[PDB]
Amino acid sequence: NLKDKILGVAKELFIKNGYNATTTGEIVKLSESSKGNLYYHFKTKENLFLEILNIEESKWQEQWKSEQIKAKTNREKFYLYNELSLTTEYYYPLQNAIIEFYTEYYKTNSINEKMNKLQNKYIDAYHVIFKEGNLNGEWSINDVNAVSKIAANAVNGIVTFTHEQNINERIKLMNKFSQIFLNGLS
Amino acid sequence: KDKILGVAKELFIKNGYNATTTGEIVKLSESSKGNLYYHFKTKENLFLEILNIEESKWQEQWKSEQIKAKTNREKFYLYNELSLTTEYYYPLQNAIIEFYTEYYKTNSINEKMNKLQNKYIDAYHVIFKEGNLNGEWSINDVNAVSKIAANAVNGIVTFTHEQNINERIKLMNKFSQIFLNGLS
Numbered sequence: 001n002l003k004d005k006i007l008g009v010a011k012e013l014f015i016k017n018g019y020n021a022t023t024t025g026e027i028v029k030l031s032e033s034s035k036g037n038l039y040y041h042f043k044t045k046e047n048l049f050l051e052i053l054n055i056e057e058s059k060w061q062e063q064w065k066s067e068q069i070k071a072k073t074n075r076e077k078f079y080l081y082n083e084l085s086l087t088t089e090y091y092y093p094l095q096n097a098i099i100e101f102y103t104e105y106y107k108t109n110s111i112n113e114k115m116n117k118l119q120n121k122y123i124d125a126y127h128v129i130f131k132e133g134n135l136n137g138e139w140s141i142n143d144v145n146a147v148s149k150i151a152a153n154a155v156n157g158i159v160t161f162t163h164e165q166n167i168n169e170r171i172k173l174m175n176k177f178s179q180i181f182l183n184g185l186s
Numbered sequence: 187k188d189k190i191l192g193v194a195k196e197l198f199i200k201n202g203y204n205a206t207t208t209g210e211i212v213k214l215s216e217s218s219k220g221n222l223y224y225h226f227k228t229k230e231n232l233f234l235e236i237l238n239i240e241e242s243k244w245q246e247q248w249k250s251e252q253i254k255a256k257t258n259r260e261k262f263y264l265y266n267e268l269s270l271t272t273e274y275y276y277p278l279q280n281a282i283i284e285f286y287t288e289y290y291k292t293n294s295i296n297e298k299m300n301k302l303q304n305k306y307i308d309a310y311h312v313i314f315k316e317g318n319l320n321g322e323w324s325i326n327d328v329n330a331v332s333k334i335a336a337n338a339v340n341g342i343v344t345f346t347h348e349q350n351i352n353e354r355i356k357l358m359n360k361f362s363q364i365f366l367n368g369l370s
């Protein structure tokens with residue numbers, strides 16, 4: 001498919017050279033298409049990227065769907081999910097493209113609203129854990145909406161802003177966070 | 187010089203590091219490519235100088251603001267709330283992270299940004315150490331907790347820019363509550 005070929009080539013280029021450095025010209029020549037056609041299917045480079053992110057996020061959800069069954073309780077799922085977010089983002093080849101993209105279009109309303117919709121599927125994973133945990137007596141949380149967003153934003157701050165490298169140490173700090181956080185809810 | 191510093195800081199906040207070009211700085215600061223050179227030499231040296239000043243200002247602000255909080259528990263709530271409102275340092279985080287995910291190899295400037303992040307972390311260290319001394323909680327690894335708090339708060343600040351300010355303060359106070367209640 002010529003739309004899927006552009007998505008695939010765009011992905012490789014965004015992996016290889018990041019979001020900023022990659023031009024529509026490159027995507028177009030390696031896809032064997034034209035800017036006119038790229039514009040047709042995705043309007044902008046920004047929107048091509050969001051489409052890739054949406055396909056990637058769907059794959060992340062399916063991975064969590066099966067990876068979570070190895071965790072009996074919702075307390076364990078919260079530990080696991082946070083650890084998984086950390087370790088996945090440590091090697092994820094699009095991670096740098098994602099950082100460049102976000103750090104440029106986070107104040108841009110029309111794109112930043114679509115970013116929010118992607119981010120809210122992460123908050124939704126926390127909502128399930130926390131709701132379902134209420135239902136089984138693991139904790140008692142009144143505002144699951146608020147706590148899910150807090151957890152989502154806190155966990156990803158630790159992931160993104162930690163320059164205290166060594167992956168072993170990063171995993172320990174994330175587990176310490178998860179302990180303190182869940183202890184605070186009891 | 188200060189015209190270059192002002193427009194840079196603002197373009198960096200708005201577009202990030204990469205998307206901000208020197209030509210645009212000198213276009214909007216009414217200067218030359220050769221005037222930015224001499225004052226700052228390179229684009230990244232300008233940025234790093236902005237960061238040093240931003241951290242200075244943030245630190246002035248907190249030194250003056252922390253007196254209003256008597257207990258270290260209260261200093262932690264306030265510090266975190268202020269991080270949402272301050273004009274200093276925190277508005278540049280996306281730019282800082284973008285810059286870090288490029289010149290992390292270049293150990294000449296990497297080392298200078300480690301010293302900047304150590305300051306950003308040491309405020310929590312003081313809070314948590316002093317809270318230990320004043321019996322507000324027991325923390326056996328303050329260095330780890332300070333790092334977790336700093337980065338967790340930064341994430342709540344940085345990833346919620348899209349919201350009503352009072353709501354963001356409500357989200358942050360809850361976090362603050364949960365976190366300190368998790369130390370007990």
Ligand SMILES: CN(C)c1ccc(C(=C2C=CC(=[N+](C)C)C=C2)c2ccccc2)cc1
Nearest residue numbers: 085088092099102119120122152153156345
């Ligand atoms: C590949 N992978 C596992 C991930 C990839 C990206 C994210 C992110 C994120 C941060 C906060 C969010 N919130 C607060 C909803 C949502 C996403 C994210 C990290 C840095 C820059 C922009 C977004 C997380 C996981």
